[PDB]
Amino acid sequence: PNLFVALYDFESRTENTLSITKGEKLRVLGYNHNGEWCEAQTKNGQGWVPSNYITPV
């Protein structure tokens, strides 16, 4: 899977994270080492989101 959708709203509170809204589509570009964060791209740009806040489409 490469195309994902947000399960829950997540609000970025730092420079490298990416805010997402439930239902919003994102492209996932990888996981970090411990797996708790994914690198995502949406129409708002690119950054990290919780890996358990998204799911494949």
Residue numbers in the entry: 63 to 119
Give the authors' words.
This domain is present in many proteins and regulates critical cellular pathways by recognizing polyproline-rich motifs (PRMs; Kurochkina & Guha, 2013). Three-dimensional domain swapping (3D-DS) is a mechanism by which some proteins can oligomerize by exchanging identical domains or structural elements between monomers. In previous work, the 3D-DS of the c-Src SH3 domain has been characterized and its dependence on experimental conditions has been described. This work explores the role of the hinge-loop composition by interchanging residues in the RT and n-Src loops between two SH3 domains: one being the c-Src SH3 domain, where 3D-DS has been described, and the other being the Abl SH3 domain, where 3D-DS has not been described to date.
In this way, the ΔG values are the same for the WT and Abl_Src-RT, but the Abl_Src-nSrc and Abl_Src-2 chimeras show a noticeable loss of stability. Similar to the results from chemical denaturation, these data point to lower stability in those chimeras where the n-Src loop was exchanged, whereas the RT loop has a minimal effect on stability. Although the conformation is slightly different in the RT loop, the hydrogen bonds are conserved. In the n-Src loop, there are significant differences between the WT protein and Abl_Src-nSrc, but also with the Abl_Src-RT and Abl_Src-2 chimeras. The same behaviour can be observed in the Abl_Src chimeras, where the distal loop shows low B factors.
